[PDB]
């Protein structure tokens, strides 16, 4: 007679934590912001079009110089574009055609991919030979690879479909820590600006916050009513937004342990595929399943803009580090940039 | 100031090389058919050729039969990738319920694949595999299909269904019943964008790959005719 009583413990604790976070829930956010001047009408136009891919584009990533962006498609190619001049620099082939993620190193020296092959392939761009090949092949997951992000030129954190996120070491080639605790598949993760802790959404309507130093889970946020597709931190590192498949976006807080705002509308009935904040954090950009991506207001929860243009489903949405431009890849092999 | 022109020329040359390579491998990407192969389990998919990718070629046509036997059993996420695939091969094991009622699970999985939002345009090849084992499943009488299906007792063999020379009328009846269950699911929902191609696997593989090639050709022809607003 352990399981039977074990559930109660959780239940008891659940109610206690529920109480704590709802007790400190005095005001909302809207109220505390009703006073602010709304951003008003915002108009965007596609400045550049990147027609180089063959199959659907499923993930992209901006570089730290806000000039070079890498893109990954299901045709087996990993193209490194150029925002300012629309010139491909490296169209490197890939072994596994079903790539589901890509990343760009903060120093601009490495890129990484990964998909159904269960392997996080890391590529080196500073080869003395010139031609770029794969340097290290990380293989320690059982489920598919969904999102990978570099911390530095030495260690990379990867999400997986086996409910376990892991921190890798490129020099050795083995997992340093293992962030077990999720129940469903893990879709996306984002790193905080200080690179000390990170959040990771999954397919159980939960966005667990981890600590890379201790290798354990610190805060677990529930609120969505369906599996979570994409997440991203607020520029200050004290908040992050989560876009799930229930056609709702929610901003959470790491010091209140409770959701602050719900970005839900009646007309939208399709789930969110990608989400990313702006430079100042005033504009929240989300990518929807209805062929277009909207631009929500992070404090007024009103559609301040809609960015159409894409024919098929959008899959990735990146904002430059300096906030000058926004890129939107979709399932039509196109990469529109917006200003 | 000549630095700007020479770096621009170098970048244009690199872009031209990238375009040439992209055209060269797009010329071959369009000619190779992709084929997702998934099943309930213990179906005997190793006889197709006799860590999961494999390829074959028939009639100067390339194929990529992508096995997924390494992932988990939660298919609602990684199956969205296989929406540009030409034909989702769905092999079923109708005689693997001895160790569960796998037939109902296969039917539900087929219904979920058929009615998915992103799999609307993907046709499905159906393989009623382990067909020879159906005969012993009814003579022994340990487990009856009619026990797990109440419409089997009131079922009659189709008039246009050709009996296989040397098959007990009851096996043919059971196999055509199962075919029709899958085909009811297939036609109940919208089917203007994709079609189902039921088949019965035999003991040799020289005809199975020919069947797959013929069905893929039919799918391509129907897509081309639909593009021209014919059907």
């Amino acid at each position, epitope marked *: 007679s352990e399981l039977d009583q074990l559930r109660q413990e959780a239940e008891q604790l659940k109610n206690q934590i529920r109480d704590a976070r709802k007790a400190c829930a005095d005001a909302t956010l809207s109220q505390i912001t009703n006073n602010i001047d709304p951003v008003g009408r915002i108009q965007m136009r596609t400045r550049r079009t990147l027609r180089g891919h063959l199959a659907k584009i499923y993930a992209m990533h901006w570089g730290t110089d806000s000039r070079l962006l890498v893109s990954a498609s299901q045709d087996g190619k990993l193209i490194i574009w150029d925002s300012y001049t629309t010139n491909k620099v490296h169209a490197i082939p890939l072994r596994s055609s079903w790539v589901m993620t890509c990343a760009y190193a903060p120093s601009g020296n490495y890129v990484a991919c990964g998909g159904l092959d269960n392997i996080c392939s890391i590529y080196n761009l500073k080869t003395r030979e010139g031609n770029v090949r794969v340097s290290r092949e990380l293989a320690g997951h059982t489920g598919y690879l969904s999102c990978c992000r570099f911390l530095d030129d030495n260690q990379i954190v990867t999400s997986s479909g086996d409910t376990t996120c892991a921190l890798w070491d490129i020099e050795t080639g083995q997992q340093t820590t293992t962030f077990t605790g999720h129940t469903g598949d893990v879709m996306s993760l984002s790193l905080a600006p200080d690179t000390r802790l990170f959040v990771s959404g999954a397919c159980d309507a939960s966005a667990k916050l981890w600590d890379v130093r201790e290798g354990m889970c610190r805060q677990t946020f529930t609120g969505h009513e369906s599996d979570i597709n994409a997440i991203c931190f607020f520029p200050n590192g004290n908040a992050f937004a989560t876009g799930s498949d229930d056609a709702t976006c929610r901003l959470f807080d790491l010091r209140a342990d409770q959701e602050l705002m719900t970005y839900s509308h009646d007309n939208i009935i399709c789930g969110i595929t990608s989400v990313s904040f702006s430079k100042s954090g005033r504009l929240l950009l989300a990518g929807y399943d209805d062929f277009n991506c909207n631009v929500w207001d992070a404090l007024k929860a009103d559609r301040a803009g809609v960015l159409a243009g894409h024919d098929n489903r959008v899959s990735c949405l990146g904002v430059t580090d300096d906030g000058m431009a926004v890129a939107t890849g979709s399932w039509d092999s196109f990469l529109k940039i917006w200003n | 100031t000549e630095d700007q022109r020479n770096e621009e020329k170098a970048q244009r040359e690199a872009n031209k090389k990238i375009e040439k390579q992209l055209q060269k491998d797009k010329q071959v990407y369009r000619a190779t058919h992709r084929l997702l192969l998934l099943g309930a389990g213990e179906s005997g998919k190793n006889t197709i050729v006799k860590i999961f990718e494999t390829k074959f070629q028939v009639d100067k046509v390339n194929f990529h039969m992508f096995d997924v036997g390494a992932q988990r059993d939660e298919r609602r996420k990684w199956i969205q990738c296989f929406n540009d695939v030409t034909a989702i091969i769905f092999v079923v094991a109708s005689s693997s319920y001895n160790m569960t009622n796998r037939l109902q699970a296969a039917l*539900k999985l087929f219904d979920s694949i058929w009615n998915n939002k992103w799999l609307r345009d993907t046709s499905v090849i159906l393989f009623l595999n382990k067909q020879d084992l159906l005969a012993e499943k009814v003579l022994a009488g340990k487990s009856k299909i009619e026990d797990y299906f109440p419409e089997f007792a009131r079922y009659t063999t189709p008039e246009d269904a050709t009996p296989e020379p040397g098959e007990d009328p009851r096996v043919t009846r059971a196999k055509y019943f199962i075919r029709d269950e899958f085909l009811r699911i297939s036609t109940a929902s919208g089917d203007g964008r994709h079609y189902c191609y039921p088949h019965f696997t035999c003991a040799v593989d020289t005809e199975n790959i020919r069947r797959v090639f013929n069905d893929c050709r039919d799918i391509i022809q129907r897509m081309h005719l639909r593009q021209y607003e014919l059907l």
Partner: nanobody
Amino acid sequence: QVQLQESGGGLVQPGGSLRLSCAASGFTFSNYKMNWVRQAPGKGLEWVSDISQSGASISYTGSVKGRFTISRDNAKNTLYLQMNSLKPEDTAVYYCARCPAPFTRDCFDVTSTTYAYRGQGTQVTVSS
């Protein structure tokens, strides 16, 4: 926080009638297709019945077709499965399951091992 509770069940004389009530709280009950999945002791999970968003499309497994009925009440956020004429080989634990995608006609919840949106269940036995 999704939470599916399965009240009812217990010990029943073979041939009796039990009404299983599934309590849901945490999502819009009217937007999801809800199913009933059972697991007999000795083998894996198997789908029993289902119901559409409004309750029009209703299906059953052939082994329990006609004997069992399913009904949903959207205004109370509850799922009802009423048992009739139980049989000895109906001894199993019944999980109330929901689908992961709202406003969709296809979904993949039969998964046995680890499916989040499924309750603890209620294990039922027939009398001897």
